[PDB]
Amino acid sequence: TAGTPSGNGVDYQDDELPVYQGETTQSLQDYLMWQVELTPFTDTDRAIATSIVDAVDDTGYLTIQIEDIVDSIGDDEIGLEEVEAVLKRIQRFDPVGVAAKDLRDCLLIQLSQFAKETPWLEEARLIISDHLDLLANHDFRTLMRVTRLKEEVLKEAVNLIQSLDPRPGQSIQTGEPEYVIPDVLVRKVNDRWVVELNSDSLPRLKINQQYAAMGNSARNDADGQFIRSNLQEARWLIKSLESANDTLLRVSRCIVEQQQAFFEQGEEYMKPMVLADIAQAVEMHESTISRVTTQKYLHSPRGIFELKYFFSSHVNTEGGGEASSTAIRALVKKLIAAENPAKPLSDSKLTSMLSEQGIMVARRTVAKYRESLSIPPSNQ
Amino acid sequence: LAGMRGLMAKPDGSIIETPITANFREGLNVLQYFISTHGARKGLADTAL
Amino acid sequence: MVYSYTEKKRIRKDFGKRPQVLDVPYLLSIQLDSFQKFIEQDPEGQYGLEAAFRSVFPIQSYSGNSELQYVSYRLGEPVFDVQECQIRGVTYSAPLRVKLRLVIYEREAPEGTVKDIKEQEVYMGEIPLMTDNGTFVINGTERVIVSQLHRSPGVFFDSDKGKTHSSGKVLYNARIIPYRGSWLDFEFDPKDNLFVRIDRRRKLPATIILRALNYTTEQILDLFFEKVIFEIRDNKLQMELVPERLRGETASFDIEANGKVYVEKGRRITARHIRQLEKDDVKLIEVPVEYIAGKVVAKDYIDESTGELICAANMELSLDLLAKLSQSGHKRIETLFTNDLDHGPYISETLRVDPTNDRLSALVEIYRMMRPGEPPTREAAESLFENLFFSEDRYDLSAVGRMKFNRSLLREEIEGSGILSKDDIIDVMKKLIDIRNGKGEVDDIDHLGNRRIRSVGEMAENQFRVGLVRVERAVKERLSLGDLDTLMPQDMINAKPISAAVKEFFGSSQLSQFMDQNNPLSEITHKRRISALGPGGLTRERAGFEVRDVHPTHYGRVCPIETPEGPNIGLINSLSVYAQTNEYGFLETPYRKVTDGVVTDEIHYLSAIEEGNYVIAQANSNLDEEGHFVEDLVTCRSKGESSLFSRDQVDYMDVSTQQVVSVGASLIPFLEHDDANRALMGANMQRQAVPTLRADKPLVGTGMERAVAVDSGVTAVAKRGGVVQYVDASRIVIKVNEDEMYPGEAGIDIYNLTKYTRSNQNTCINQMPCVSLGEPVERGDVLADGPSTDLGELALGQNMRVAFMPWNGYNFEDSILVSERVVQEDRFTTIHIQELACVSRDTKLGPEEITADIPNVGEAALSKLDESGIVYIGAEVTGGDILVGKVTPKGETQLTPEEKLLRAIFGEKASDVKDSSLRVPNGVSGTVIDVQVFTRDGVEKDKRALEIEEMQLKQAKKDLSEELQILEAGLFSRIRAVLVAGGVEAEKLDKLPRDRWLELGLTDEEKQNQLEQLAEQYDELKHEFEKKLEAKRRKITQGDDLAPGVLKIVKVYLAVKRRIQPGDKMAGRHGNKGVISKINPIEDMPYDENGTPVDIVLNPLGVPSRMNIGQILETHLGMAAKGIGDKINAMLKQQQEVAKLREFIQRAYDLGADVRQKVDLSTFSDEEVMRLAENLRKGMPIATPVFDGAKEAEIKELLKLGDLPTSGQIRLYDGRTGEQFERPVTVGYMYMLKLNHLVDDKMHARSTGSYSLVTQQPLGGKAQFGGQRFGEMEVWALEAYGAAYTLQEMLTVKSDDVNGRTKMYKNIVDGNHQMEPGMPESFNVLLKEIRSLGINIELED
RNA sequence: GCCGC
């Protein structure tokens, strides 16, 4: 290693019998319930506040309906008239705009708490937020005529709109778990692309299991011999770990030899690898190989980190033989990305171009591929 | 400080025959300081146990 | 000659009085010698991995007709130096390459071979290398490895103090320790029977181990006891005479010699009667038959008539048995000594204890006893006994163990086998038996002749061996299944176990730890440190009072001052300044030989036993010009004692008084006027001082500051110094003198001075040059000084003007009153450097990118970020400012219409990517100092990174082109000389480049030989320089092979200044510590008649009860030194002529009472006198050695020469009222240190934070925002007060009441102040834990 | 490992 990162901060409970214990953390709802406790509320008001705080998502939005909140209470004199009042009180909390019904509600609540002398407060308070929101989503060229205002003033009214916070309530959120990957199966580039299995720790577990179980057995302080108590348990542990490691290594080897085309040259050279294809390769059932490849990750210099991605069973009735949709999806992404400023990319036109390239795909099949991670560039 | 340091010895509890005839205003010898280190260490170890 | 260039600049006035026979050692050679004897190869197997390789190899598979032949090894060149390793966070190591050959032996032909494959060397593991200072950079740290003091292998005899059975019975035991293997014990029960404890198992009698060596009881009886012959012929029944043994006995009957009475019956036994009997030559004499009744037969006499015989050895005889033996024809009967005067009944009683009389019976007995499992089959026991002892692999005494074993048994030979033989156990048992009988004595376990030292090299060798043995095991198996095609690398090279063991030892070990980097002296003390703990050592609680005591053999080996205080007292020690280690591993100290009545300058090193044997004189004993003692009777140490002896009686003399003081203690002036236990505190506190903004030399020293400063490796020392050519704050270039040079390529010296950098304790290490320009430099001179160093002298504090008086309660107890002038002048101000790091790793959502743009963050936080998104170099950051901008992707594949709307109004990401950026932690104010972006191979280089690369390569070519320029200048000079020799155009030739087209050809010889060779050398030099520069450039820009997950690492360094404050802790070097109580304005401090105020006010009450007299003497001597400096400064102000200034300096230097230091300004240059005077303008740096230094009279005459009061006390005035204090107040100069204890690092307050998941109780400790623990004694105090509500509020809510906490917080915010207490969650956890057992516990109503 | 006992 040319350079090594510094060790990440870790801790463990010392001078405490239940080792490592734990640590409490603050969340969005925990921080909202803290504010509920410190504001003057009645018993029923506190109950409603807890009910609507429980329904706040991580983004801080209100996933459940107000009418559903009223239904949940199931109490007389708890109609939506007072549920709305408690809801507004909660919305005016430290993450301003939290617990909002929708995007319009966030912006309307956020704009309420301002100097009231903002240069374009009233220009964007309701005219842009509470009305013609879809126009602001679009270019809003006609919005200038709709609001009877010049484009110049709107050019900064939308600037203020963007200055307003998009999704309030995810700022207080911490985010300590980075969900990093150890990449149990590193693979490298050689004259034939060899692959290896790291983090096995089987010899490490073997040595520790020896020094503990076989160590106690070999220690002649105890009468007799502990040849069956733990000596024939460490062997089972080692055998289980080695069997799992061998199965994983063999399956990953089959995947690599089949998908070497992906790693070589361009990435989008995936074969539609079905579970049976590797099942016959290892002479083993597909279900056992499948369970194995569910969350195992490989480290690639350029390739994606995920065994399941290679399966792509997408014969797609391609012209010569078969193909894979994931490669077809990458092709569609690249084609749509590199187009004219108009960028038609019509699902009929895109399908015709793909068929000319040799991929006989239906017109609607390309549309589902595009809608998976993109939007039509004014193709309508 | 101004008179003899006196008779002292604590290797096992006995007493060294020749005492320290020097105070702290005058210097101690290497031998006298080495002798006094025994009692110093004994006291310091007694304190921490 | 008399003084070096660096020492002529400022000469310390030594007070000496005793010449030095030898100088002081490096003090870090130990570590260096050990590791050099480790990595370095040896023609024999004496030292180096070579010994381990020969111990393991050759290896062959069972019945494999296959061998591994080993031939040599080689260590590779490291890919990074110490600096790059330390900045990158990697380990500084070297690749290990070993050449080995595989030979296949013929199966058909016995002892014949068919194949022999000698392929090239193979690579296994990486060996960490120690730096020139004795440190191991592993994972970018320092990690000194501490030496260990353990018991040497051998044989030892003890007596367990004779208080076990409360009967007053002393029980003697013997013990054998090998280097590796099982142990052996011999013990005595209160019944006096030999017992053997093998490997700390159950007690077993010695007869079975005796018989397992094929020893019959009869044979054993003869060896165990001396036999006496009883002859019964013709009913006479005569007795053989042994007068020597017959010392104490009662004559049961008249004893007659040759028919004449010699000793009457019951006649008193007298040494005179025995002598008279021995004088008369007498043959065998008759005795009463009844006496033999108590005797015990030794042999087993056989009856010639029938096979029946009395073989019952260890048994007595009966009267009827006499008739049986007479009838059988037994004329002579063999019986053992049966005497108890000095000898005693042993072995035979143990024989009566156990009846096993066969080798097989003993073997099966020991196999069953030591292994209580399956019974053996005549083979398990036979194998086990060989495995226990005398097995080449399982059991081994070292060469030290064999030497000690032979020495303890008084054997002429020193060398021997590593395993014990049959005779060794016999000799040990015989010696143990004799010890009880009276001959011999028990040895001391704390004697330094029984305690050995292991350094880093030996431990590294041991760990390498375990990796070898581990790898060798796996190697054996694959030879069985290995075809001829198989190659060594394919013969289970197994580089994994060797490297794993090596890194396990070097990284995670008890004796491996960070080196203290507060000061150079602290690093030196850590490097020279001896520990009794560790793997082979003793645990803390397992230690006792006697182990932690000062032993008389500690004299010149370990200082009796420096040691930790609380738990580790007496278990961690330091080497004395002159101590050295034996090849076996025993501490040594040097002494001067004494021949006749005159000491000789020849020096011998003696171990504890060697010193004890001779009478050693004291260091402070006066001598004559010829070397003869001035006084007949001299003080000496003979055998752990001290008394008066004649000068001739002395055989050796102490080389120096310091011989008994550690290097750290050697730095306490007037140490002998300080209490030893108190001095311990001063020596310990000296290593906690932090370097300040500017180093200041001690005005009062001991003369050891230069050795510590230079030997620590902190300064820059001229390795081959010539003349200084270029100087800068970061570089020094020296033009080496031509008197010594390496032929070819000439050469110059380049030194890259270290700038501000983090230390292990977050302090700053910086180097500043001491030379100006064109200055001559000799070998070993100091060019630049590091942290806390001044002109090559250790300078770890500052010189304060101190008054000793009480001041209105502001120095009550140990408080210190400091003036504001100290704060204004930035004395005691330190720089602290911190390191923060940010790493980007690929995630399931996707790669983690580092960018300047950040969602949901205002422009204000991005003001200080670069285009990449990193704080600008030199930015000042506080609070929670953003250092590196990083965004992690989120997981989303269902585009909700609102999400599409959010993406429509806002950016494409719509702030979906979360914010995980490096922000400054709260309470941390720092200025951007250094950014260290590292990039993965293949990924796009960071925009900031290319700038770092450009700086790197620019510096590389800048420091590389100098040698090329010098070489090309030399070549041009040679060409110019050649063209001058013929066809010289002078300035015309010099104007045209390329030597004016090489000056055409001129003569044929010049064109063919001179010009052609010059052009060839020019082209070769240019090509070599270009290739070297290209190689350096290619090395600079390379992809960083990082961890598979890791994508990019960015490191940020912050620098802060710590202002001096009252909550801060200060100390002198005499054990006088205290915290600041107040920072006083300058007009309030006491001042003298000239209007000069003091800087510090110290309490006089701290001196007399602490016996810190060195404080006062140091203060008086500092006053004298500053007075002399003041006189010199006044003379320099008025620009007096050099002659009288030189005269006054000379008068000050040669003052004293017969001091050894002789300095004359007569041989001093006139300019050098001026420079020296300006250097000692502040004060004269006096030096008083440890036990041989200045006296009161000398201090007084120095005070007189400085025109100061002789008592050391002056008149002082109150700064607030102007009134004179009644009594005179002592005023002078003292060296004060600032320790690493600060209120900022020790101020914490919590109202409410996070809590442990278990017990629902707040966390503990700062850096975690914890609460203070209310322990058991606090609760006892609250109970004693009767404060029930305070205790309930501490025990319940505000601690573990989950609902009570929130209710109390709400009430306090509402201004109610009502507890409303509930039940703690810890008690619920306890109830659940108890119920989880089989016990039902409930709360009744 | 260190600090206050």
UniProtKB/Swiss-Prot annotation, chain B:
It comes from the Bacteria. Belongs to the RNA polymerase beta' chain family. The chain holds residues 740 to 788 of 1407 of the full protein. This is DNA-directed RNA polymerase subunit beta'. Co-administration of salinamide and rifampicin or salinamide and myxopyronin suppresses the emergence of resistance to both antibiotics. The RNAP catalytic core consists of 2 alpha, 1 beta, 1 beta' and 1 omega subunit. When a sigma factor is associated with the core the holoenzyme is formed, which can initiate transcription. The rRNA transcription and antitermination complex (rrnTAC) consists of RNAP, NusA, NusB, NusE (rpsJ), NusG, SubB, ribosomal protein S4, DNA and precursor rRNA; S4 is more flexible than other subunits. Acetylated on several lysine residues in the presence of glucose. DNA-dependent RNA polymerase (RNAP) catalyzes the transcription of DNA into RNA using the four ribonucleoside triphosphates as substrates. Resistance to the antibiotics salinamide A, salinamide B, rifampicin, streptolydigin, CBR703, myxopyronin, and lipiarmycin can result from mutations in this protein.
UniProtKB/Swiss-Prot annotation, chain C:
GO terms for molecular function: DNA binding; DNA-directed RNA polymerase activity; ribonucleoside binding. Acetylated on several lysine residues in the presence of glucose. Changing D675 to A/G: Resistant to antibiotics salinamide A and B. Pfam families: RNA_pol_Rpb2_1, RNA_pol_Rpb2_2, RNA_pol_Rpb2_3, RNA_pol_Rpb2_45, RNA_pol_Rpb2_6, RNA_pol_Rpb2_7. GO terms for biological process: bacterial-type flagellum assembly; bacterial-type flagellum-dependent cell motility; cell motility; cellular response to cell envelope stress; DNA-templated transcription initiation; intracellular iron ion homeostasis; nitrate assimilation; regulation of DNA-templated transcription elongation. Co-administration of salinamide and rifampicin or salinamide and myxopyronin suppresses the emergence of resistance to both antibiotics. It catalyses: RNA(n) + a ribonucleoside 5'-triphosphate = RNA(n+1) + diphosphate. Keywords: Acetylation, Antibiotic resistance, DNA-directed RNA polymerase, Nucleotidyltransferase, Transcription, Transferase. The modification N6-acetyllysine is found at K1022, K1200. Changing L680M: Resistant to antibiotics salinamide A and B. InterPro entries: DNA-dir_RNA_pol_bsu_ext_1_sf, DNA-dir_RNA_pol_bsu_external_1, DNA-dir_RNA_pol_su2, DNA-dir_RNAP_su2_dom, DNA-dir_RNAP_su2_hyb_sf, RNA_pol_bsu_bac, RNA_pol_bsu_CS, RNA_pol_bsu_protrusion. It is an enzyme of class 2 (transferase). It comes from the Bacteria. Signal peptide: none annotated. GO terms for cellular component: cytoplasm; cytosol; cytosolic DNA-directed RNA polymerase complex; membrane; transcription elongation factor complex. Its EC number is 2.7.7.6. PANTHER family: DNA-DIRECTED RNA POLYMERASE I SUBUNIT 2 (PTHR20856). Belongs to the RNA polymerase beta chain family. The RNAP catalytic core consists of 2 alpha, 1 beta, 1 beta' and 1 omega subunit. When a sigma factor is associated with the core the holoenzyme is formed, which can initiate transcription. The rRNA transcription and antitermination complex (rrnTAC) consists of RNAP, NusA, NusB, NusE (rpsJ), NusG, SubB, ribosomal protein S4, DNA and precursor rRNA; S4 is more flexible than other subunits. In pull-down experiments interacts with CedA. (Microbial infection) Interacts (via flap domain) with Escherichia phage lambda antitermination protein Q; this interaction renders bacterial RNAP resistant to transcription pausing and allows it to read through termination signals. DNA-dependent RNA polymerase (RNAP) catalyzes the transcription of DNA into RNA using the four ribonucleoside triphosphates as substrates. HAMAP family: RNApol_bact_RpoB. This is DNA-directed RNA polymerase subunit beta. The gene is rpoB.
